[PDB]
Amino acid sequence: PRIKKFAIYRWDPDKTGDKPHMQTYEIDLNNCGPMVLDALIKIKNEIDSTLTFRRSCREGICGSCAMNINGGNTLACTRRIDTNLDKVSKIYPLPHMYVIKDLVPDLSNFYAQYKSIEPYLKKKDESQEGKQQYLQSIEEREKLDGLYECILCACCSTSCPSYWWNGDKYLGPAVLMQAYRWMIDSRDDFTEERLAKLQDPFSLYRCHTIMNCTGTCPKGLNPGKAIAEIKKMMATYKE
């Protein structure tokens, strides 16, 4: 016998007047997996089937189980339960985000921002494509490392203080890092006009390098660093 405590943010949109409160659950760790997602599933499957959350891969390559556990934004299938028995683990939905139902946040704005940065290879010719492979040296390929792996978990932008106050007009690290990802790709021709997409004070220039995005990345990526590279490209680029 070995018990652990979990405090979870709860909000039902069906019952009117039901204001957001906290509910506690207790589960044995010998009967449960090491990760927080295993715990959530267990209380979902046994104790209360009214708990709602997004889950899929339980491998840490979706961004489905992205939440605020113990004050930080990571994945529930990646981060493990603190074997410390007396301390209660607090689980919240991603910060400063509209909650659809407990733990499930609205990401419609987040996804639409990724659309607006145009995340696809753009060329001058679309006639000679599909038939021959584009050439790219290993060094040019190496510049994409630490950028292509981004899973769009949204632990990133939801941790950014600028993204809280300015969720509407400022894109946020995750989205910005992808915008950068398509810039340094040797195959891409539309690099100069990709930078011209950010000539307003909100798009890119709300990042004051506060640095909460990198310190929360579940995949170990460095988005903040990439933002500074965009800034560098923005002041240097020709025409």
């Binding site: 209360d48 089937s49 959350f53 899929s56 979706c62 995340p119 696809y120 584009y134 292509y148």
Partner: protein
Amino acid sequence: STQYPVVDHEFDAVVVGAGGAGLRAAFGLSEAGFNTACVTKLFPTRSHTVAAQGGINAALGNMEEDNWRWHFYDTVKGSDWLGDQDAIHYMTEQAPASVVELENYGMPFSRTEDGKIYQRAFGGQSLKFGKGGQAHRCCCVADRTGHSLLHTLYGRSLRYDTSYFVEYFALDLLMENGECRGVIALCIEDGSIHRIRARNTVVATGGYGRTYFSCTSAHTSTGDGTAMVTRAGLPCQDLEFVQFHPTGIYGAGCLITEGCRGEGGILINSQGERFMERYAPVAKDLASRDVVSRSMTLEIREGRGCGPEKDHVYLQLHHLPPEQLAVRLPGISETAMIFAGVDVTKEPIPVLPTVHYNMGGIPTNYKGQVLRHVNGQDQVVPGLYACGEAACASVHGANRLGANSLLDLVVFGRACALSIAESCRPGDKVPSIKPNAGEESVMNLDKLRFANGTIRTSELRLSMQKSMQSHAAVFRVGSVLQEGCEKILRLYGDLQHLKTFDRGMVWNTDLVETLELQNLMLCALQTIYGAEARKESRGAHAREDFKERVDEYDYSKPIQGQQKKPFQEHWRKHTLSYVDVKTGKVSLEYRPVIDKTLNEADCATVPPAIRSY
């Protein structure tokens, strides 16, 4: 009735599923100029092609020099001659054309000295028609290939005017007199019921790996389109054929890539012997999956297991150079460090043969059209298509080759697009559906929402999972299968006894997992009964009582003096299963394997031969 807001939509073509195959079929239609809709329960990135690691097979010949006609021989061999050669032909030739398509989309393929797409050795692939040693044709974005595949497709998909119903659980197909009119779906956000009608419907819902307790597949691999098809009374092909991937972590069942064995990884037992030498002399540890998983499971029976429970096996990566281990395989370097807590460069990974791919699914034309069985013959289901894991053109056959699924995705996704763009035109008359249709799809939904039974939803799920895991596994016998069949059948009656707890509209996961359950059970019943019915050893389906490759002839000796067997005597045929929804009893028949190619001159038919590596 009257509780749910019936909302109707009008479209040219509907795609169910936004992962890989579905995604490729979606924008390929909008590319042709179709008012296309895409229905998906997950956000397209959260689909399961993202979990792919090994790569994608294409005969580009960048490593040395290749021929797609050799890629045909290898797939048609690995299929254990259950594979329809018309589909394999089309896939192997379209292979370079579909991959160069992806690189030109922006897929960050790993690079070589030339600056070309990095291919690498994989499970059971050979040069010069299985004569010229090991073949290296698995294209890969260094260990996170399906991640890039899904992303670069989705990224390229925003370049078209496709409509996406994100988080909309598709309930049933819309059907009127043998013809498909689209899909009825539940909005997960607000709870309203949407009916999306179109001239055509593509089904790309993926596999049903969650039928078993142990699997590599994601929690949302529930084979829903497979269930949708069977509720329409349409057949399901080769359902008993279930792939057991040799390398999966002892814990939750997380996949370690076969690219491990492809790069230089060796598989080791308790004694210390490379046990993939006495079992397979030529191909060894990089042999076919139905040989490796067959060996690993049989090695545990001997008592040669590893660990405190004596049930799991080890995969060596210690000997590999750290130089290329961090480059070629960094995704498994991180994910084996988490669930196992194992230093990938110094310590070996704990592995286990677990459920992975679903070979069978929905009977599918080489052009993507869904097929039914009328009077022993084939018949096109009007306005219905399928591509990917949920599909069964049986290009994979009895056993799927290493990294041949992501090809099956893009090629047949494209096929589903082309065949709609060629057969009909966009803006053509959208067939009208009855105002009363989707009637009992609501009734099924509403009963599961109000459920006031006695047996918990999760407790009935695990009952199915463990009953499948033990009864119909790697090795199975008519004694244990018979018991498992009546075990699952009696469980289907227990579905009317279930208890739900959520009485809400917004994001009722309690309800959608129960809809996942109904869609899993139907996929389970046909798999178990199909396994009992088949009394032979062909690829993944291994019988300890019938360890025989039962073809039309004995293909070890030359076929001349031998007399041919009739159709209802040999087993070289596709299993077609139906299920009555009320009683639950599985009625199943059979159809012949396609042995003809597209063009005999350009690509010759490969006849059945010896099955070993």
